[PDB]
Design a protein around this ligand. Structure first.
Ligand SMILES: O=S(=O)(O)c1cc2c(O)c(c1)Cc1cc(S(=O)(=O)O)cc(c1O)Cc1cc(S(=O)(=O)O)cc(c1O)Cc1cc(S(=O)(=O)O)cc(c1O)C2
Ligand SMILES: O=S(=O)(O)c1cc2c(O)c(c1)Cc1cc(S(=O)(=O)O)cc(c1O)Cc1cc(S(=O)(=O)O)cc(c1O)Cc1cc(S(=O)(=O)O)cc(c1O)C2
Ligand SMILES: [Cl-]
Ligand SMILES: [Mg+2]
Ligand code: NA
Length: 129
């Protein structure tokens, strides 16, 4: 599934991401934009044998189990396939875990490089939230 910005902003808000650990809603929408282009099916391979999965490109090295990332962790206690669902619930809950574990949103490369210190509110303006 591919979200529009306002659609994703609404879903994320419903899932309690707005101001989660101090990060306003637009940060989460912006991160999803540059990580996955709002695509729940997005996957990207890493040089360490891990894979980044789903709307927020959560990786199999630390956060989920894909059965093909030797020696990795599964700190969100989920199959990586759950991060590829049309329903963003697993992705959102795992992202909360990543952030609340003390990693910040800085965990997300694309967010750090393209969202942090920008007008992230642009991502939600004009939406009917
Ligand atoms: O894209 S929109 O934000 O305009 C939208 C609004 C409503 C919708 O019903 C939908 C989209 C369709 C829809 C989408 C999704 S999602 O893309 O996966 O996020 C999920 C649902 C859904 O009907 C199912 C659903 C989930 C939840 S949740 O437990 O909070 O995630 C709540 C609802 C759902 O229908 C109720 C609901 C809340 C809201 S509100 O944003 O809280 O006002 C709007 C609409 C609702 O149907 C009314
Ligand atoms: O990720 S967070 O938004 O939670 C965060 C907030 C602050 C932080 O200090 C950091 C993270 C740590 C941090 C990370 C990095 S990174 O490697 O690029 O991820 C860089 C810095 C940093 O403190 C250094 C730094 C850079 C910049 S920049 O010119 O925009 O690149 C600004 C600042 C920095 O400390 C000041 C600053 C701005 C911001 S703001 O989000 O732009 O308002 C938050 C915090 C800040 O310390 C307060
Ligand atoms: Cl915002
Ligand atoms: Mg990425
Ligand atoms: Na893993």
């Amino acid at each position: 599934k591919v979200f529009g910005r306002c659609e994703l902003a609404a879903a994320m808000k419903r899932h309690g991401l707005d101001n989660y650990r101090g990060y306003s809603l637009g940060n989460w929408v912006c991160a999803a934009k540059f990580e996955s282009n709002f695509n729940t099916q997005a996957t990207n391979r890493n040089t360490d044998g891990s894979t980044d999965y789903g709307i927020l490109q959560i990786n199999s090295r630390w956060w989920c189990n894909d059965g093909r990332t030797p020696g990795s962790r599964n700190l969100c206690n989920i199959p990586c396939s759950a991060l590829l669902s049309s329903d963003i619930t697993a992705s959102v809950n795992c992202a909360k875990k990543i952030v609340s574990d003390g990693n910040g949103m800085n965990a997300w490369v694309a967010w750090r490089n393209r969202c942090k210190g920008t007008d992230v509110q642009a991502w939600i303006r004009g939406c009917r939230l």
